Amino acid sequence: NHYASKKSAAESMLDIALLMANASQLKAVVEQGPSFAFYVPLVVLISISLVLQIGVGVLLIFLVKYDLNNPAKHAKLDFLNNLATGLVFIIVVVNIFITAFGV
Amino acid sequence: NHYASKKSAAESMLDIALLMANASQLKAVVEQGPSFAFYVPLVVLISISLVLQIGVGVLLIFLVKYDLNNPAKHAKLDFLNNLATGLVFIIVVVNIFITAFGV
Amino acid sequence: NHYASKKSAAESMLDIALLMANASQLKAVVEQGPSFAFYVPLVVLISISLVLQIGVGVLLIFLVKYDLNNPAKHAKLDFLNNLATGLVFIIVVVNIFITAFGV
Amino acid sequence: NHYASKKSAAESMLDIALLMANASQLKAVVEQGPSFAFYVPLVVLISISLVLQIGVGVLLIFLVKYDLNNPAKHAKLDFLNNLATGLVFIIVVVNIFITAFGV
Amino acid sequence: NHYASKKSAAESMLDIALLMANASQLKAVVEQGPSFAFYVPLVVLISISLVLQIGVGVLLIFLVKYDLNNPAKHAKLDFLNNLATGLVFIIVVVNIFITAFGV
Amino acid sequence: NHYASKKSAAESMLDIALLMANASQLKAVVEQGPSFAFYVPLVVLISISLVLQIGVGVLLIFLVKYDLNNPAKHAKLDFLNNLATGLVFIIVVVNIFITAFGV
């Protein structure tokens, strides 16, 4: 008898992000790096990775909830799917760079 | 009697980017910074600024050339315009940070 | 009961890239090289290899998802397939160069 | 009374490339750099810049000569124009980096 | 349930090139040569050999995929086959020269 | 009253090549280089440049003389023109490298 949506919202975005493992490691690497010494090339990758994770999450959720809000949008969905897919691919590349602990 | 498009393409994107002044300063700041000493907080801003400049340029050009490619896209144009405008606003904020030569 | 697409997008591009083995080695070679000494001719090959991997991935995904978006595109598909195939062939050549640990 | 096409071909591509000024400077910078000392970050930019100049030139010429070879290609032309424009924009960014004589 | 084409493209060109053994040896010879001493006459042969391998691979793949793209091309196929065959023959001659470890 | 074709053939190819200025300089550079000292990176460019000049000359002359030998070849002409144009563009790039007297 608890018809709230706070729990609904948190689970909805959490399942739409699913970056907990990705971000969690990103926190350790960006924490260990500066702690050990001054290494510039890795923090940049972390900064970009999280930024793109936000952008893709922003785009994915909106069209995931609905696709008939506008009078007609049938082919443009692929373009947004195309754009989001490219962002994920970039995220994959950078995530591979950082886990190597080097450029 | 030179019906090429190389000149057309370069001018088209150059007028669609118009970041020459923005980027040019970004090059000097990212060059002077590391030259003087190890300062981490500024290079990150430069990295993000150029990244967003690319993203907005990518989005702007496609819909600028045409808007009737899909069967119907009349209200979604605002959403893309909304997204691009937000990116520019972020670019403005970071550009203001870096020109201050501090966090 | 999790109708998300984040997992869908990541798997889609990951299976469309399948460069994890290729890139992973690229990270080690580009890390060991500068670590040992200054060797210019190998890093360039790594830089080009990943660049082309991105370009081919960009082209492959778009037409893989659909091929009837435009009013009619039946013969142009081969041209894009021709272009992507050439990029892969170039990627093969450079990948062979770098694994030789020499020019 | 010289109905050859060698002169036609050379002028056609030369006007389609128009990188003589761009490349010519690229030669001096990539020559002075290694001559002075070992500086890695600049040669990579030169290598990428020329590579993209080739790719865009490859794409531009084919569709510039004709656009009705296939049964119908009216909307895909924009996609190729979109792809080529992005490559030029990348070329602009790197060209700006290298002329700064720094990262 | 993985309807991708990255794997398709890589295998397609790899079976269309089948130079892995040829190139692999080319890497060792071009690596050992300069390592031992300054010997000019062999590297040139390696450079030409790989160049022709690219050219023939470029020509072979396009017409291998299809031969009815144009309104009619029945006799010209032999000319392209003639041209590609000559390139392979040249590749054979140079490959024989280099394996002799001499001019 | 001299209905020979030796003079016709020599002029025909000479006007179809028009590399006398290009080759003539190529001879001096490839002569001065080894004379001064052992410099590997320039002779390779000369070797490739002349090779491509031959290939383009081979292709250009055949289709220049006639284009109706086969039952029908109307669209394939562009492909050959496309291939030859690319070779010239490569020749331009290398010719620019060598005239710089450096890599």
Residue numbers in the entry:
A (entry chain F), B (entry chain C), C (entry chain E), D (entry chain B), E (entry chain D), F (entry chain A): 39 to 141
Paper text:
Plasma membrane rupture was long thought to be driven by osmotic pressure, but it has recently been shown to be in many cases an active process, mediated by the protein ninjurin-18 (NINJ1). NINJ1 is a 16-kDa plasma membrane protein that is evolutionarily conserved and found in all higher eukaryotes. Our data thus suggest that, during lytic cell death, the extracellular α-helices of NINJ1 insert into the plasma membrane to polymerize NINJ1 monomers into amphipathic filaments that rupture the plasma membrane.
To characterize polymeric NINJ1 at the atomic level, we expressed full-length, wild-type hNINJ1 (residues 1–152) recombinantly in Escherichia coli and extracted it from the bacterial membrane with the detergent n-dodecyl-β-d-maltopyranoside (DDM). The filaments were linear stacks of subunits, with an interval of 20.95 Å and a slight rotation of –1.05° per subunit. The cryo-EM map had a resolution of 3.8 Å, enabling us to build a molecular model of filamentous hNINJ1. The next 103 residues (residues 39–141) were well represented in the maps and could be modelled unambiguously as four α-helices α1–α4. Notably, the experimental density comprised two identical hNINJ1 filaments, which were packed together in an antiparallel arrangement. The hNINJ1 filament is organized by stacking of adjacent protomers in a fence-like manner. The two antiparallel helices α3 and α4 (residues 79–103 and 114–138, respectively) form the core of the filament. The two N-terminal helices α1 and α2 (residues 44–55 and 58–74, respectively) are separated by a distinct kink at L56. α2 thus adopts a parallel orientation with respect to α3 and α4, whereas α1 protrudes at a nearly 90° angle from the helical bundle and connects to the adjacent protomer via an extensive polymerization interface. The intermolecular contacts include multiple side chain interactions between helix α1 of one protomer and helices α1, α3 and α4 of the neighbouring protomer, of which a salt bridge between the highly conserved residues K45 and D53 is the most prominent.
